[PDB]
């Protein structure tokens, strides 16, 4: 389970911000790890946990899954206070067999990745427009 | 019951604070002898709580029990009020047995100090990243 | 990080000195736990800290950190070196969760520095309530 | 132990302008800077802090668009971002410490060793 | 808070001692502080929570007084100890500073 200060390259709505986050630590209870971004508030951070699984015998397959959790907080207009406002929750859940090779899962993989920067998902998703 | 307006020297995040104690009163509904920070709003203050305790037929142990509660207020929200926002216990229970003698009891407490100085434990509670 | 950890300059006259090798998180609860290294299965100081998240239904940190050491006794003509009183002490701490990391580290110092205090360490080594 | 900063440009009206200042001796991890205003014939008045992680940024009442500050943990250095200049408030500002803190609200405050001065004039 | 204080300019002898009167509109629980200014710098602290004095000030400087009105109490005028000197304040909300006292000889 090795874990490093992960830097993130190229993501915004230009492309030009970057990212740094650094680790957090693995919760032992559910296998949850956790990157999270430097800051002091532990509740006004970008977060990101991945959480590998295993089969028992109730659901018998790999259950992949990311969260990420971006909570934008507005701007406390007293003087001081800071208050979080709004979240933004992202979802991916893989759900791959016991018997699948690595070039089907990188296929599924890279094939995620690339319909993401696809100029149709991102007319769905940056405008909230229904597809077209 | 002696007491006197107590010092804390050398304690903040760089340890270059101090601060200054007096105190105000032993309860005796329940053995607590306060020490707080000299402020005028009864709320708004600093306050340190200790309470020797003694044994009765039900437990049968000493306890010691120590409470510190912070209180970081913030200022105007639309109005100068001063009002309070979020509040930062701490907790510390000694369970000392009868026939305990002290120098494992100081020893407990010497402990108890070196370890809250110690690199693990400021990296778990000062960044809360679980160790 | 987990590390050996040795307490410096402890003691009741402050010449003793103590060191720890972490003996690893229990998975269960998540409990983390160093101990000092003696033989015994049984005899060993050991201290004990973990710190949770909050959960749905409190939600604000909750730090808390055990420290349990026992003693020893003598030979009743096995050699077994029982262990007769417990002397468990605890800390725990809650800060909020908005709570910035000036306000929690300051908590945490002060709790330190007050036990050396005199007003302390006559409450406890003595037993005086103050 | 040194506390410059350089941004001291002649700048138009309604224009903007970014300073800096670095720090030595200090940890700068360990405290929160502020920016501290005197106006140029006599008298003084704060500008806006942070606390030690750069999360919390405190402002005044009176102005709340015009400022904003970033803090830079990497390089020991803090941003001042100033943005709509007003004409009449150009002043020579300084940084402080977070030296000598205490109190329940954490803009009670003390200021020890300040900075050199760099104008901004409009 | 309008934080006051009286003297605009003084003069004293290199040896009588004098004090900076100031006065709080509102009650304050003992939380100013005292700054120096010289000619051509920047200020400094002089005095701390309005009677502790730091080891970076001289052992001349003291300050006193509880609740509404606060002062320094400058026993000895050494030469060129000179300048502007601020007060400050660090209750309610925006902290706002004097509006200056001359201290030529």
């Known amino acids: 389970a090795k874990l490093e200060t992960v830097t993130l390259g190229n993501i915004g709505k230009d492309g030009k911000q970057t990212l740094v986050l650094n680790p957090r630590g693995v919760n032992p209870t559910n296998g949850v790890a956790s990157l999270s971004q430097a800051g002091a508030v532990p509740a006004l951070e970008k977060r990101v946990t991945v959480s590998v699984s295993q089969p028992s015998r109730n659901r018998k397959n790999y259950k992949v899954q990311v969260k990420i959790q971006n909570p934008t907080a507005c701007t406390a207009n007293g003087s001081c206070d800071p208050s979080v406002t709004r979240q933004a929750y992202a979802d991916v859940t893989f759900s791959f067999t016991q018997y699948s090779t690595d070039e089907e899962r990188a296929f599924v993989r890279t094939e995620l990745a690339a319909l993401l920067a696809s100029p149709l998902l991102i007319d769905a998703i940056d405008q909230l427009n229904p597809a077209y | 019951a002696k007491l006197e307006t107590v010092t804390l020297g050398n304690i903040g995040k760089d340890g270059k604070q101090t601060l200054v104690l007096n105190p105000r009163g032993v309860n005796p509904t329940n053995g607590v002898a306060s020490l707080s920070q000299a402020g005028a709003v009864p709320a708004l203050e600093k306050r340190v709580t200790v309470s020797v305790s003694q044994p009765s037929r039900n437990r049968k142990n000493y306890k010691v029990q120590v409470k510190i509660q912070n209180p970081t207020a913030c200022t105007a929200n639309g109005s100068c009020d001063p009002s309070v926002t979020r509040q930062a216990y701490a907790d510390v229970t000694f369970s000392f047995t009868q026939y305990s003698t002290d120098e494992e009891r100081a020893f407990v407490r010497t402990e108890l100090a070196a370890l809250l100085a110690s690199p693990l434990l400021i990296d778990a509670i000062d960044q809360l990243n679980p160790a | 990080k987990l590390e050996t950890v040795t307490l410096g300059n402890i003691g009741k006259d402050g010449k003793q000195t103590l060191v720890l090798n972490p003996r690893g998180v229990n998975p269960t609860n998540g409990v983390a736990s160093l101990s000092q290294a003696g033989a015994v299965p049984a005899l060993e100081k050991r201290v004990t800290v973990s710190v949770s998240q909050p959960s749905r239904n409190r939600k604000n940190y909750k730090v808390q950190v055990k420290i349990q050491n026992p003693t020893a006794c003598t030979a009743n003509g096995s050699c077994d070196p029982s262990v007769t009183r417990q002397a468990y002490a605890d800390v725990t701490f809650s800060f909020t969760q908005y709570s910035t990391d000036e306000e929690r580290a300051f908590v945490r110092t002060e709790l330190a520095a007050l036990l050396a205090s005199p007003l302390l360490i006559d409450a406890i080594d003595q037993l005086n309530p103050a | 132990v040194q506390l410059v900063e350089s941004g001291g440009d002649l700048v138009r009206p309604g224009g903007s302008l970014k300073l800096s200042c670095a720090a030595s001796?200090?940890?700068?991890?360990?405290?929160?800077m502020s920016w501290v205003r005197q106006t140029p014939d006599k008298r003084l008045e704060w500008v806006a802090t942070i606390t030690s992680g750069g999360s919390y940024t405190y402002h005044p009442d009176s102005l709340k668009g015009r400022i904003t500050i970033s803090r830079d943990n990497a390089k020991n250095t803090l941003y001042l971002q100033m943005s709509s200049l007003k004409s009449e408030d150009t002043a020579m500002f300084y940084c402080?410490?977070?030296?000598?803190?205490?109190?329940?609200?954490?803009?009670?405050?003390?200021?020890?060793?300040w900075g050199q001065g760099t104008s901004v004039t409009v | 808070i309008v934080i006051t204080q009286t003297p605009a300019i003084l003069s004293v002898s290199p040896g009588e001692r004098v004090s900076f009167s100031c006065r709080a509109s509102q009650g304050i629980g003992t939380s100013i502080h005292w700054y120096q200014q010289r000619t051509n710098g920047s200020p400094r602290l002089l005095i701390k929570?309005?009677?502790e004095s730091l080891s970076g000030t001289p052992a001349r400087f003291s300050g006193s007084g509880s609740g509404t009105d606060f002062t320094l109490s400058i026993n000895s005028v050494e030469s060129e100890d000179v300048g502007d000197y601020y007060c400050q304040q660090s209750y309610r909300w925006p902290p706002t500073f004097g509006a200056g006292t001359k201290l030529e000889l």
């Open positions: 402080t410490r977070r030296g000598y803190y205490s109190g329940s609200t954490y803009v009670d405050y003390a200021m020890d060793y």
């Open positions: 929570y309005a009677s």
């Open positions: 001796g200090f940890t700068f991890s360990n405290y929160g």
